[PDB]
Amino acid sequence: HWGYGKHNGPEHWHKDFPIAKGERQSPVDIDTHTAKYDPSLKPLSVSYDQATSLRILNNGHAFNVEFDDSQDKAVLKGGPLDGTYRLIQFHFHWGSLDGQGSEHTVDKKKYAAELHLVHWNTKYGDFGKAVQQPDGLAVLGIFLKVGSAKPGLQKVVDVLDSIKTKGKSADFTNFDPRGLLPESLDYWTYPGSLTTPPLLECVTWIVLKEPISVSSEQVLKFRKLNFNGEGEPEELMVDNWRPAQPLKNRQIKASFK
Template identity: 35%
Template structure:
């Protein structure tokens, strides 16, 4: 009986010492104690609900919403200094309070930027959380915002639309993205969990897309993609991807989880859409329509020319 009690105590201590009950699938081992994505609902029941993220966006099933107008970004161009930290699951940068906001795009008012983090694969392989028509990109950036009226993310998550996350894909490029030089170099200083270093003079504008590439996007209601998986997120997933070289993408895989394993495949698998509607902005459709019109015109002119 004493041995049985001792076993339970040791198991409890192991859970406390690891610092987290949940982990990514790449961390799961036969003798391990963390719960992979399939069992996250045992860590938090929210993870088993019906409006979970990420999802696969099937473009032909998206619904055009012409009220999904371009966003209004305020402070995205403002340079700031902050810590970049290996938090044991990803790299995260906290954004100074009230530095940057986003509105428009059919959001319910103005949302202020709180932090950003990333999800990636293994040495530049597939690693984004959301997928487009089944395609998984190498990496995905999440800029987390909350409604201006809230003073903490905890409070914002109690509101069904309290949090707005802007998601950006990355794609492999043949050339180095110099805008990311300082960010990628900082990764070498935060290899292990809880390590951090200072990032100087960065801006959200520098890390994202040009304004012209931020008008085509998808919108749906979902959740956080890590436990507690709270279903209070208005998701915006941009169509265009940020270019990074293969070497830059691979640098993220040099980080390590809290257990010392390589920090790779840090994404939650696709969740059921459960009849949720995914909307698309009107701009993407307009651009596509213009392209089709021009192509049709060339074909028509070509056919009308005499031999």
């Protein structure tokens, strides 16, 4: 099925998922000199104190840290959003080398990786019905650069040895996603899509301007994961990023002057 190799990578995905060539695909390049400050934006509220992580899963494309979304426990509100969006999972995209790995770019700059915290609009009752809606989802996107270690990431790095291959999962309780956030919540926002199949056009993207720094050793451990299942030839899980897609008839708005 789909992946990130020569034969099944992002340029192929449109054959099984025609929305790949849609009007509101993600990611995009964020041209900082075309994005405009929007005074109509309310302050962004990241309310993660009651977050309940459950498990971490290698799905043969990335790894997901999954949360209990059965109540309003870890929510995103404010900014461009109308109402309350509940955190369901996060995951990353990364490169084989530090010069690439992000999906959004900033003035064509690629970061070493990118974190996506996925949330769904509680007015639609659950995630499945949220992805039938143009405002069903909000993804908080955070760039990673290589520099100092991120201590709030090390519990993730240390569990990766136990979910090396596709279909492996591990308990992952009591993980605090606050430890993944940069100091500033300045952001760009635009209407887009999920960046993996099914590529659904439901997402209000909120992409933080300030990257987090992780260490070379941390990112190196991401690169030891496998796309393949146990007992299959090793294909290292690297370069699991979709490139920038056409902006089409969209505007990117900045939360800051």
